[PDB]
Amino acid sequence: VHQVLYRALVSTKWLAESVRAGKVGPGLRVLDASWYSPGTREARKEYLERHVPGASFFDIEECRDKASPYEVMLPSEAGFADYVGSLGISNDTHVVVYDGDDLGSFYAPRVWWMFRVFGHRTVSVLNGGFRNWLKEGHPVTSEPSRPEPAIFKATLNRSLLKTYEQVLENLESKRFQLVDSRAQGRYLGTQPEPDAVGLDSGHIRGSVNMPFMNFLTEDGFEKSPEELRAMFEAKKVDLTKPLIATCRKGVTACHIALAAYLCGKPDVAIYDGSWFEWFHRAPPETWVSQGKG
């Protein structure tokens, strides 16, 4: 089972029984892919302390194009491959991803999207994250997880990724819908982009703003299809037409993609470079801010 539409979301209950069943192994690998702004939370430490039994830590910082000047850029296929392989994940395993965000889901979508872009379809996100796992009393541990290495092969699926040149052309073709998942304020230019030197805020021209946190519920669970569908709609985003999601560094843009997929559209592509690279590569005329004119 890989699918026309594979199980994008698994539940806590689901994960718990699998663990109990002794399901975690070569066919099922769990991953913590938590990441937080420097000086706030310590993901890896947090992970070492308590993690779903048998879970591994997935390091965003390690898994990327270390050689690019931009933030968290996709690694190469070989890179990706060796990485996931060492975590004991083969082309045959079903990958479950989670993060510790208080919102319930921040970085997990990113990892989900990363597997897919590299050619794996059997990957899913724990709905309501570690937040929920804990809140429900599921089993936690600090024991070390040491998976046996597996061989994984990956293949880039160019259609789920967009580059600079491609978003630029889109400026003229207008063929795909550009949706921005950043906080309204950063989108509008009213608030500044954090963790950058000289980086101005604002958005690519003709982009639409869809704040990630709007797809989650107070309890930190994904909204329901009916809910998601009405959202894209109220926003004048047509699931029927082509769509490109962007953000700051192509992280929460993945929340646009997962929401579309549970809505039946699995082909939302992600602008990995995002605003960070855009701001440093494009002509200023291509963007706008509710400030610096």
What residue ranges do the domains of the chain occupy? 1-156, 157-293
Rounded CA gap, 258 and 256, in Å? 6
Query: Is 63 considered catalytic here?
Result: no
Rounded CA gap, 54 and 83, in Å? 17
Residue 174 is labelled as binding a ligand: no
Q: What is the length of the chain?
A: 293
Rounded CA gap, 220 and 35, in Å? 17
Residue 249 is labelled as binding a ligand: yes
Element (H or E) spanning 77, and its range?
helix 77-86
CA distances from 251 to 2, 7, 26, 95, 206 (A): 24, 21, 27, 18, 20
Determine the distance from the C-alpha atom of residue 47 to the mean position of all C-alpha atoms in its chain, rounded to a whole number: 19
Rounded CA gap, 215 and 204, in Å? 22
Instruction: With H, G, I as helix, E, B as strand and everything else as coil, classify residue 208.
Output: strand
Q: Where are the beta strands (DSSP E) in 170-288?
A: 177-180, 203-204, 207-209, 243-246, 269-271, 287-288
Common-topology check for domains 1-156 and 157-293: yes
What fold characterizes domain 157-293?
A: Oxidized Rhodanese; domain 1 (3.40.250)
Rounded CA gap, 51 and 56, in Å? 8
Catalytic residue among 63, 247, 254, 263: 247
For residues 63 and 263, the answer to whether their CB atoms sit within 8 Å is no
Instruction: With H, G, I as helix, E, B as strand and everything else as coil, classify residue 21.
Output: coil
**Which position has the token pair 């994984």?**
152
How was this one solved?
X-ray
Q: Class for domain 1-156, per CATH?
A: alpha beta
